[PDB]
């Protein structure tokens, strides 16, 4: 296990030690059954990968001056054209949903028909970064930890946006300009008595 989430507390007896990112954090005992634990493990890994891609995309698009992550589908609310890296795109919302739905359905169907494979490798690992199983477990710990941080970061993005209105990069600069005056307590909705 990677450690203990709560010092002094004993880890649950149903969490295997060889599991990547095992911190013994399960106060609700949701992964009590091994069948549910396997599905939740694959779901957590997939969630972390998608969260990493989403956080990286939001930060990149906001740091490149192409608007925040919230103003991304705004071109299809009032009528416009999407621009990727400043290059015009001739696809409308009606055609984008069709191609994305077809491609995602085919890829997800192929992935789910394997019986819940979490670490496929092979075609998805052309560089061979996991050729030996001795170091494969160490990188899995980094992967699940980065995914957990990415999920928390995306939750923070959505929460800070709904609480203030500014984007993640715009909120960071505002907090760095006025730390005591710009935080979660000065937004006005986190603490109603203040």
């Amino acid at each position: 296990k990677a450690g203990n989430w709560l010092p002094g507390s004993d880890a649950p007896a149903w969490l295997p030690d060889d599991l990547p990112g095992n911190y013994g954090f399960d106060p609700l005992s949701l992964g009590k059954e091994p069948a549910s634990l396997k599905r939740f493990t694959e779901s957590e890994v997939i969630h972390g990968r998608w969260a990493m891609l989403g956080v990286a995309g939001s930060l990149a698009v906001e740091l490149l001056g192409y608007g925040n992550w919230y103003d991304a589908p705004l071109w299809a609310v009032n009528g416009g054209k999407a621009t990727w890296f400043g290059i015009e795109v001739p696809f409308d919302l009606n055609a984008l949903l069709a191609f994305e739905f077809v491609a995602m359905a085919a890829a997800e169907g192929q992935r789910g028909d394997a019986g819940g494979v979490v670490y496929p490798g092979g075609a998805f690992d052309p560089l061979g970064f996991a050729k030996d199983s001795s170091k494969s477990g160490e990188l899995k710990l980094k992967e699940i930890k980065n995914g957990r941080l990415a999920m928390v970061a995306f939750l923070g993005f959505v929460a800070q946006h709904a609480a203030t209105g500014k984007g993640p990069i715009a909120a960071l600069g505002e907090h760095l300009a006025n730390p005591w005056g710009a935080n979660f307590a000065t937004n006005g909705i986190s603490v109603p008595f203040f």
Partner: protein, 217 residues
Amino acid sequence: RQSWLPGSQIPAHLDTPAAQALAGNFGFDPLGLGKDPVALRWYQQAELIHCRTAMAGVAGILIPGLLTKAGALNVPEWYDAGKVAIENSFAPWGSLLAVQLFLCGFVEAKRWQDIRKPGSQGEPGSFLGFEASLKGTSELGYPGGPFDPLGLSKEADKWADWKLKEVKNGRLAMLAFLGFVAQKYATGAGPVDNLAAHLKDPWHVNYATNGVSLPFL
């Protein structure tokens, strides 16, 4: 043996070992609605649901009303909060009630199925892996898993006392809401305002002075 009436004949159905296992057993059943063990179990579930619902409602009425009296909040009266909240809203009351009925019907149907068969909600391959956590404890109406995240029900020594603080308080809340309705049809003001008006002059402002609760006087 604690009783709701010292000297009164406690019913035989309320003296069974199973009936005494329930929290807040004071031998109160003048109509004999708990003679049938199945009926007693169903009514025990109903009392628990009513206690929790009444506690949440009375809390949502009393706390914002007490904060409104001070400068903490500006929440309107409980009998007028519906209109004010639906005025500057995003949907009419009909659409909101429809979504509410759907979402409440799903969970109440699951709770009903678990009442009919305890632990039946843990059927494998039925809730995307979350069915295991949907099985409650040995006592009906006291589930674990997603509910009770702090895990305060694992210590048995306080468990028997914890339930006593849940039913009794709930019973009080059930009467509280009743008062909230009666006072609404007797004084025309809110509960906090009625409390303040009574504290101003208790010897002349009560239910025997409004002329509604005592028409013969």
